Design an enzyme around this catalytic site. Structure first.
Site, PDB file in Angstrom:
ATOM      1  CB  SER A 271      -0.950   0.040   1.157  1.00 16.34           C
ATOM      2  OG  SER A 271      -1.973  -0.954   1.025  1.00 16.34           O
TER       3      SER A 271
ATOM      4  CE  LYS B 169      -4.534   1.919  -1.239  1.00 18.55           C
ATOM      5  NZ  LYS B 169      -4.028   0.584  -0.886  1.00 18.55           N
TER       6      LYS B 169
ATOM      7  CB  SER C 120      -4.784   1.352   3.368  1.00 17.62           C
ATOM      8  OG  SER C 120      -3.622   1.038   2.624  1.00 17.62           O
TER       9      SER C 120
END
Length: 244
Positions: free
Chosen positions: A50, A53, A97
């Site tokens: 993540s 991102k 997330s």
């Protein structure tokens, strides 16, 4: 007045007590410092999970694939976690997330443009493979904790090759805490695909006086650890070092 031997011992013991193996890299100006109970992790490659991102957001905003106020609707399908079953801006999806939103953003970017942009930014090993919507989870994209803290340092100082406004928009999404006049910006990561599993928390502290201190925690996640161990180890480390 505290010896560096004592700082090293205390931060090592936070990883020891969480029964994990991990490193936290701190960057002050140009100097990198490595702490924790597994220092050799510092130049090994792991999936970004993540943490990607943050770059996914920069690329999507720079290329007009989304705006910061746009609402990504939940499509109504069951999602791995109930907190993801709702409509979200990129900024809300960053904090939760929420993979489905960032997967939608990657598809809007498309494989070709994502590859060119990940190359242009020189993120990790720069290789995204042929599936635009999952390359940050199980390969082939990988990055070292040193590369992560250098990426955070770049974003914190607006040095990535994206407009200033794009970098500022993504940084507003990353504020996770205020502590005695200090602001922590960071993105967490938990790569549940790979074995062993990898945990991240990458960001920077902005101190009252304006100085920014980047950090990257990287640890092994084991079955039935709380995600919040990433936060606790990070906070205790930054506090022990007097950074917050």
């Amino acid at each position: 007045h505290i010896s560096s031997q004592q700082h090293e011992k205390a931060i090592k013991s936070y990883f020891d007590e969480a029964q994990t193996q991990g490193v936290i890299i701190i960057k002050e100006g140009k100097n990198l410092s490595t702490y924790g109970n597994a220092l050799a992790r510092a130049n090994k490659e792991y999936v970004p999970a993540s943490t990607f991102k943050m770059l996914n957001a920069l690329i999507g905003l720079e290329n007009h694939k989304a705006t910061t106020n746009e609402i990504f609707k939940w499509d109504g399908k069951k999602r791995t976690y109930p907190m993801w079953e709702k409509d979200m801006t990129l900024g809300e999806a960053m904090a939760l997330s929420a993979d489905p939103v960032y997967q939608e953003l990657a598809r809007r970017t498309g494989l070709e443009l994502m590859q060119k942009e990940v190359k242009r930014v020189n993120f990790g090993n720069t290789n995204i493979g042929t599936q635009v919507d999952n390359f940050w989870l199980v390969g082939p994209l990988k990055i070292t904790p040193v590369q992560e803290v250098n990426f955070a340092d770049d974003l914190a100082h607006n040095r990535l090759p994206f407009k200033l406004e794009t970098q500022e928009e993504v940084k507003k999404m990353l504020l996770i805490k205020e502590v005695n006049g200090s602001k922590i910006y960071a993105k967490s990561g938990w790569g549940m695909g790979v074995t062993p599993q990898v945990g991240w928390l990458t960001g920077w502290v902005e101190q009252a006086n304006g100085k920014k201190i980047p950090f990257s925690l990287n640890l092994e996640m084991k079955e039935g650890m709380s995600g919040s161990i990433r936060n606790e180890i990070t906070y205790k480390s930054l506090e022990n070092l007097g950074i917050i």
